[PDB]
């Protein structure tokens, strides 16, 4: 008697578990390396779980800080033409920083912060930083190098922005579950460098939607994997691969044209011309229905819409009735931007999942 009763209790439990799964939106974050996928996940935690509640991440921030200064300083003599210190008295600091580049488990002594700060204030170091698209530099370099004095304090506690800016590699598949207004979301974060893309197929089962993230600002950079392929070209080629992939033909794509702040900054700097990398930009005109933010520099508007339209040219070329691409301009480190963008996705995501039920 109690045997059949335990049994269909398990079975009522099983049926509830099936309905939870069916109604949970599985969101797969795809995009090339450093496009911003893990930062989007961190924002979902800030907005909808408990964020980072931090002391675990202090070493990661210090490692980013160290990677940034040592990368810039190492690049100075390797650029063509090389970049010289503005104050050649700083050479002994260059020597120190380069000498500790590959020490595992670095102990971050006070001289490290002293030398890093002095070098970061050197106009030559800064001129090398301004050429960083000629080498490989983490995006958070300026943010952390500007607060060396904060990070080095013994009582340093990272802010939420520090944790968002912190770059770590994503080796493997990382899941994050969260609930917004009793709707359940299940986000899958994966690495986006080329070798990590072999893992992506493991997540294609029962996907509700893809969030495809692009570093819009990286149009003048090349990928780490071969130090030759343009990063935006790689993003486009990768998006075409996803849009047309055998397993993902039914799956709609929310396209996050991310790093809008860095793109704005690169446009305003005026050094790196998009048409030097994408010659067709010279003939591109901002669309009639563009909606620039008040005061946005029209050069920025034209840039960001050109990049959007390079992706939409791919997504409009196939799939017309079977899946759709929803573009959004994003700044993944801006919590209020991601709050607004994600809220504007919740209705379309619910609709994607409902249509999936009729197809099954
Ligand atoms: N200023 C700015 N920084 C951004 C933005 N999106 C990401 N970043 C920064 O760019 C770096 C890379 O971001 P991350 O989320 O780790 O990229 P990813 O796509 O997960 N990289 P991977 O594929 O290797 O896992 C981080 O330092 C992150 O803070 C953005 O919109 N604006
Ligand atoms: Cl990218
Ligand atoms: Mg990542």
Residue numbers in the entry: 17 to 69, 88 to 394
What sentences appear in the manuscript?
We identified two macrocyclic peptides, GN13 and GD20, that antagonize the active and inactive states of Gαs, respectively. Co-crystal structures reveal that GN13 and GD20 distinguish the conformational differences within the switch II/α3 pocket.
The structure was determined by molecular replacement and refined to 1.57 Å. GN13 assumes a highly ordered structure through extensive hydrogen bonding networks with three well-defined water molecules. One molecule of GN13 binds to the switch II/α3 helix pocket in Gαs through hydrogen bonding and hydrophobic interactions. The side chains of GN13 I8 and W9 (IW motif) dock into two Gαs hydrophobic pockets. The Gαs/GNP/GN13 structure strongly resembles the Gαs/GTPγS structure, suggesting that GN13 recognizes the active conformation and does not induce significant conformational change upon binding. In particular, R232 of switch II in Gαs/GDP is predicted to create a steric clash with GN13 I8, explaining the state selectivity of GN13 for the active state of Gαs. GN13 binds to Gαs/GNP with a KD value of 0.19 ± 0.02 μM. The active-state inhibitor, cpGN13 inhibits cAMP production in cells by directly competing with the Gαs effector, AC.
